[PDB]
Design a protein around this motif. Structure first.
Motif, PDB file in Angstrom:
ATOM      1  N   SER A 127     -42.612  65.737 -28.370  1.00  0.00           N
ATOM      2  CA  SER A 127     -41.198  66.051 -28.281  1.00  0.00           C
ATOM      3  C   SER A 127     -41.082  67.411 -27.622  1.00  0.00           C
ATOM      4  O   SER A 127     -41.731  68.369 -28.050  1.00  0.00           O
ATOM      5  N   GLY A 128     -40.278  67.488 -26.590  1.00  0.00           N
ATOM      6  CA  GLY A 128     -40.240  68.698 -25.828  1.00  0.00           C
ATOM      7  C   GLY A 128     -41.412  68.708 -24.876  1.00  0.00           C
ATOM      8  O   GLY A 128     -42.094  67.708 -24.673  1.00  0.00           O
ATOM      9  N   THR A 129     -41.631  69.862 -24.272  1.00  0.00           N
ATOM     10  CA  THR A 129     -42.641  69.955 -23.242  1.00  0.00           C
ATOM     11  C   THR A 129     -43.400  71.248 -23.406  1.00  0.00           C
ATOM     12  O   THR A 129     -42.837  72.306 -23.678  1.00  0.00           O
ATOM     13  N   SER A 130     -44.691  71.139 -23.226  1.00  0.00           N
ATOM     14  CA  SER A 130     -45.537  72.305 -23.135  1.00  0.00           C
ATOM     15  C   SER A 130     -46.617  71.871 -22.189  1.00  0.00           C
ATOM     16  O   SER A 130     -47.308  70.895 -22.466  1.00  0.00           O
ATOM     17  N   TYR A 131     -46.701  72.515 -21.127  1.00  0.00           N
ATOM     18  CA  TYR A 131     -47.690  72.177 -20.160  1.00  0.00           C
ATOM     19  C   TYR A 131     -48.837  73.120 -20.308  1.00  0.00           C
ATOM     20  O   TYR A 131     -48.640  74.333 -20.256  1.00  0.00           O
ATOM     21  N   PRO A 132     -50.022  72.615 -20.501  1.00  0.00           N
ATOM     22  CA  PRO A 132     -51.141  73.474 -20.826  1.00  0.00           C
ATOM     23  C   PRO A 132     -51.663  74.108 -19.575  1.00  0.00           C
ATOM     24  O   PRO A 132     -51.452  73.644 -18.463  1.00  0.00           O
ATOM     25  N   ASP A 133     -52.359  75.184 -19.785  1.00  0.00           N
ATOM     26  CA  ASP A 133     -53.108  75.757 -18.701  1.00  0.00           C
ATOM     27  C   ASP A 133     -54.359  74.970 -18.456  1.00  0.00           C
ATOM     28  O   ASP A 133     -54.704  74.685 -17.320  1.00  0.00           O
ATOM     29  N   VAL A 134     -55.075  74.656 -19.497  1.00  0.00           N
ATOM     30  CA  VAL A 134     -56.381  74.100 -19.336  1.00  0.00           C
ATOM     31  C   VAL A 134     -56.339  72.619 -19.577  1.00  0.00           C
ATOM     32  O   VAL A 134     -55.425  72.068 -20.171  1.00  0.00           O
ATOM     33  N   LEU A 135     -57.385  71.986 -19.131  1.00  0.00           N
ATOM     34  CA  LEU A 135     -57.427  70.561 -19.157  1.00  0.00           C
ATOM     35  C   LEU A 135     -57.578  70.109 -20.581  1.00  0.00           C
ATOM     36  O   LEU A 135     -58.382  70.627 -21.337  1.00  0.00           O
ATOM     37  N   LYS A 136     -56.816  69.114 -20.932  1.00  0.00           N
ATOM     38  CA  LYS A 136     -56.863  68.556 -22.248  1.00  0.00           C
ATOM     39  C   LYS A 136     -57.449  67.182 -22.161  1.00  0.00           C
ATOM     40  O   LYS A 136     -57.382  66.513 -21.136  1.00  0.00           O
ATOM     41  N   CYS A 137     -58.029  66.803 -23.258  1.00  0.00           N
ATOM     42  CA  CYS A 137     -58.816  65.614 -23.369  1.00  0.00           C
ATOM     43  C   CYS A 137     -58.353  64.886 -24.591  1.00  0.00           C
ATOM     44  O   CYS A 137     -57.944  65.479 -25.574  1.00  0.00           O
ATOM     45  N   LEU A 138     -58.489  63.590 -24.533  1.00  0.00           N
ATOM     46  CA  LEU A 138     -58.158  62.776 -25.669  1.00  0.00           C
ATOM     47  C   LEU A 138     -59.113  61.628 -25.641  1.00  0.00           C
ATOM     48  O   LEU A 138     -59.257  60.957 -24.629  1.00  0.00           O
ATOM     49  N   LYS A 139     -59.742  61.388 -26.747  1.00  0.00           N
ATOM     50  CA  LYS A 139     -60.525  60.189 -26.881  1.00  0.00           C
ATOM     51  C   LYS A 139     -59.594  59.140 -27.403  1.00  0.00           C
ATOM     52  O   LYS A 139     -58.888  59.369 -28.381  1.00  0.00           O
ATOM     53  N   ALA A 140     -59.586  58.009 -26.755  1.00  0.00           N
ATOM     54  CA  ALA A 140     -58.618  57.061 -27.119  1.00  0.00           C
ATOM     55  C   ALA A 140     -59.230  55.718 -26.864  1.00  0.00           C
ATOM     56  O   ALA A 140     -59.893  55.520 -25.849  1.00  0.00           O
ATOM     57  N   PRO A 141     -58.948  54.769 -27.715  1.00  0.00           N
ATOM     58  CA  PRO A 141     -59.490  53.442 -27.526  1.00  0.00           C
ATOM     59  C   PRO A 141     -58.563  52.589 -26.711  1.00  0.00           C
ATOM     60  O   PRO A 141     -57.344  52.718 -26.749  1.00  0.00           O
ATOM     61  N   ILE A 142     -59.180  51.675 -25.999  1.00  0.00           N
ATOM     62  CA  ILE A 142     -58.442  50.629 -25.345  1.00  0.00           C
ATOM     63  C   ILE A 142     -57.922  49.700 -26.406  1.00  0.00           C
ATOM     64  O   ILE A 142     -58.661  49.261 -27.282  1.00  0.00           O
ATOM     65  N   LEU A 143     -56.668  49.378 -26.320  1.00  0.00           N
ATOM     66  CA  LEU A 143     -56.108  48.479 -27.283  1.00  0.00           C
ATOM     67  C   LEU A 143     -56.246  47.074 -26.794  1.00  0.00           C
ATOM     68  O   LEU A 143     -56.445  46.813 -25.614  1.00  0.00           O
ATOM     69  N   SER A 144     -56.111  46.164 -27.714  1.00  0.00           N
ATOM     70  CA  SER A 144     -56.165  44.785 -27.346  1.00  0.00           C
ATOM     71  C   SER A 144     -54.947  44.450 -26.516  1.00  0.00           C
ATOM     72  O   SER A 144     -53.891  45.074 -26.624  1.00  0.00           O
ATOM     73  N   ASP A 145     -55.103  43.438 -25.684  1.00  0.00           N
ATOM     74  CA  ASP A 145     -53.979  43.002 -24.891  1.00  0.00           C
ATOM     75  C   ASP A 145     -52.845  42.594 -25.797  1.00  0.00           C
ATOM     76  O   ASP A 145     -51.688  42.892 -25.512  1.00  0.00           O
ATOM     77  N   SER A 146     -53.146  41.940 -26.900  1.00  0.00           N
ATOM     78  CA  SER A 146     -52.058  41.510 -27.753  1.00  0.00           C
ATOM     79  C   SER A 146     -51.309  42.705 -28.297  1.00  0.00           C
ATOM     80  O   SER A 146     -50.078  42.720 -28.322  1.00  0.00           O
ATOM     81  N   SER A 147     -52.011  43.737 -28.719  1.00  0.00           N
ATOM     82  CA  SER A 147     -51.286  44.880 -29.235  1.00  0.00           C
ATOM     83  C   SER A 147     -50.528  45.564 -28.130  1.00  0.00           C
ATOM     84  O   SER A 147     -49.412  46.031 -28.340  1.00  0.00           O
ATOM     85  N   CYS A 148     -51.117  45.625 -26.965  1.00  0.00           N
ATOM     86  CA  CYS A 148     -50.451  46.262 -25.862  1.00  0.00           C
ATOM     87  C   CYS A 148     -49.177  45.517 -25.533  1.00  0.00           C
ATOM     88  O   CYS A 148     -48.104  46.112 -25.396  1.00  0.00           O
ATOM     89  N   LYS A 149     -49.276  44.210 -25.445  1.00  0.00           N
ATOM     90  CA  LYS A 149     -48.114  43.407 -25.125  1.00  0.00           C
ATOM     91  C   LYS A 149     -47.118  43.410 -26.255  1.00  0.00           C
ATOM     92  O   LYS A 149     -45.919  43.304 -26.016  1.00  0.00           O
ATOM     93  N   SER A 150     -47.574  43.534 -27.483  1.00  0.00           N
ATOM     94  CA  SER A 150     -46.637  43.680 -28.577  1.00  0.00           C
ATOM     95  C   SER A 150     -45.893  44.979 -28.478  1.00  0.00           C
ATOM     96  O   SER A 150     -44.703  45.035 -28.794  1.00  0.00           O
ATOM     97  N   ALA A 151     -46.590  46.034 -28.101  1.00  0.00           N
ATOM     98  CA  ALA A 151     -45.940  47.313 -27.997  1.00  0.00           C
ATOM     99  C   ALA A 151     -44.965  47.324 -26.849  1.00  0.00           C
ATOM    100  O   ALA A 151     -43.924  47.960 -26.950  1.00  0.00           O
ATOM    101  N   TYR A 152     -45.273  46.615 -25.778  1.00  0.00           N
ATOM    102  CA  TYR A 152     -44.485  46.675 -24.555  1.00  0.00           C
ATOM    103  C   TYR A 152     -44.244  45.280 -24.049  1.00  0.00           C
ATOM    104  O   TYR A 152     -44.764  44.872 -23.010  1.00  0.00           O
TER     105      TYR A 152
END
Ligand SMILES: [Ca+2]
Lengths: 223, 9
Positions: A127-152
């Motif tokens: 919420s809102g914006t903060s643009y970082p100076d340095v590169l940020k990383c996120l480990k994130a899993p690929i979701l199943s197609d069904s969950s993806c399609k459920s979400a969207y």
């Protein structure tokens, strides 16, 4: 990247920043002269900034190289965001080094639950914006197609996948577009879109790079 | 929205 962590300088050496007098999208270096990014990041005046960590400070290791070609997928649809992939040819080959390195393209698509590293200089706030100076990383899993399609529902094409965290709090966000989703050392995704960032049940959607490897290779080979 | 600066929504 919301809910991520500071990658560490040059720990994502394939991450590039697309800069038009400001960082506006990420990209992934896939060879010394080509970057993969999102089609929706297309614009004129792209300077690819490789080797970046703090994108607001010249720290060393940067290579700024103008895009000489920006090749939006011919079937990119800016409304549906299908085929949200763009290849940027650098005006000159980047000097590859430990801090500026290409990332392999997939040889096959990734499976749900594979953990990927998503990185970028995008907004770090859901919420809102903060643009970082340095590169940020996120480990994130690929979701199943069904969950993806459920979400969207009705929005996920075969060229998209969701990745991230349905519980909210961890996602790519504005400014991350175009950047990498690297899973098992392969660029499987391009940060593309999502409903907000890091919102519950609204995971990030990513261009499914494995669907484009041939296109990438053919496009590079012909350019 | 796309996750570009600016977002395309
Ligand atoms: Ca810098």
């Amino acid at each position: 990247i919301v809910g991520g962590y500071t990658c560490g300088a040059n720990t994502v050496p394939y991450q590039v920043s697309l800069n038009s007098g400001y960082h506006f999208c990420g990209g992934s270096l896939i060879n010394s002269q080509w970057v993969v990014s999102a089609a929706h990041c297309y614009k004129s005046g792209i300077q690819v900034r490789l080797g970046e960590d703090n994108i607001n400070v010249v720290e060393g290791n940067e290579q700024f190289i103008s895009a000489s070609k920006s090749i939006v997928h011919p079937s990119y649809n800016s409304n549906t965001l299908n085929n949200d992939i763009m290849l940027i040819k650098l005006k000159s080959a980047a000097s590859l080094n430990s801090r500026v390195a290409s990332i392999s393209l997939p040889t096959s698509c990734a499976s749900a639950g594979t953990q990927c590293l998503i990185s970028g200089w995008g907004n770090t706030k859901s919420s809102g914006t903060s643009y970082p100076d340095v590169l940020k990383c996120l480990k994130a899993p690929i979701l199943s197609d069904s969950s993806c399609k459920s979400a969207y529902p009705g929005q996920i094409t075969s060229n998209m996948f969701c990745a991230g965290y349905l519980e909210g709090g961890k996602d790519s966000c504005q400014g991350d577009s175009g950047g990498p989703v690297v899973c098992s050392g392969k660029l499987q995704g391009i940060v593309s879109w999502g409903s907000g960032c890091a919102q519950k049940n609204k995971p990030g959607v990513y261009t499914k790079v494995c669907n484009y490897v041939s296109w990438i290779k053919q496009t590079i080979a012909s350019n | 929205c796309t996750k570009s600066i600016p977002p395309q929504c």
